[PDB]
């Protein structure tokens, strides 16, 4: 997940990016390549929840993008699905 390669030829497969660095504020950029598979077979996040029976899944959800990726779709779908 934290994959940023300096080699500049294996760059198109790098995962972490740096958008803009205006002083104190850094703008990182994570790819949702397999994290939220919209029209694909099966996702990373689905195996984190539906398939993995390992104890470490509590820690494994506490990685960087997924703590904010889950807050994305919660803010868009939580208030709507509750009101229904």
């Amino acid at each position: 997940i934290r994959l940023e390669i300096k080699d500049e030829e294996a760059r198109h497969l790098s995962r972490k990016f740096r958008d803009w660095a205006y002083g104190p504020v850094y703008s990182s950029l994570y790819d949702l390549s397999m994290l939220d598979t919209c029209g694909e077979e099966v996702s990373v996040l689905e195996i984190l929840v539906y398939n993995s029976k390992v104890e470490n899944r509590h820690e494994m959800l506490a990685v960087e993008p997924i703590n904010e990726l889950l807050r994305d779709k919660w803010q868009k779908f939580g208030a709507v699905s509750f009101y229904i």
Binding site: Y22, G23, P24, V25
Partner: protein, 157 residues
């Protein structure tokens, strides 16, 4: 070349030899550096503002040269003091950018040629997080230099 797209590139390239003969070229076609077209129609980003974005180790030699070309046209208080014309990055000048990337050598160059100290970067980006912006510093370059953990501009201002 004679167009704007060649000029906005080479400044980011930082090759002053590829910018030769343009000061007599403005004498021919009577054009100012910030007349209509050598400035972004969407934002207002000029050549000097583009020069401070893309840096070569924090050094671009076009920066005194763009002031030099502006001196012959007579826009030293205009080519430096032209803020952004957009809404999101509204009011940001080249003075705000040079303080931002800690070009202490280039901060001194702007004011001596004439720079408005009290230019306010009052854009929607420069709002606090409750208002929709990402970074707040009170819209002032003196306050900006204090916010960038740099007292060296603070001594200079």
């Amino acid at each position: 070349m004679f167009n704007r797209h060649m000029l906005f590139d080479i400044v980011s390239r930082g090759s002053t030899a590829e910018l030769e003969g343009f000061l007599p070229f403005l004498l021919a076609q009577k054009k100012r550096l910030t007349d209509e077209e050598f400035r972004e129609a969407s934002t207002g980003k000029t050549c000097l503002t583009k020069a401070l974005m893309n840096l070569n180790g924090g050094k671009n030699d076009t920066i005194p040269m763009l002031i030099d070309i502006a001196e012959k046209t007579g826009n030293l208080r205009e080519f430096i003091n032209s803020p952004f014309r957009d809404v999101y990055y509204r009011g940001q000048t080249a003075l705000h950018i040079a303080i931002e990337r800690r070009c202490k050598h280039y901060v001194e160059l702007l004011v001596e040629k004439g720079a408005d100290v009290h230019a306010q970067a009052r854009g929607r980006f420069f709002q606090p997080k409750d208002e929709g912006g990402y970074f707040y510093f009170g819209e002032l370059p003196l306050s900006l230099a204090a916010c960038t953990n740099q007292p060296d501009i603070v001594h200079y201002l």
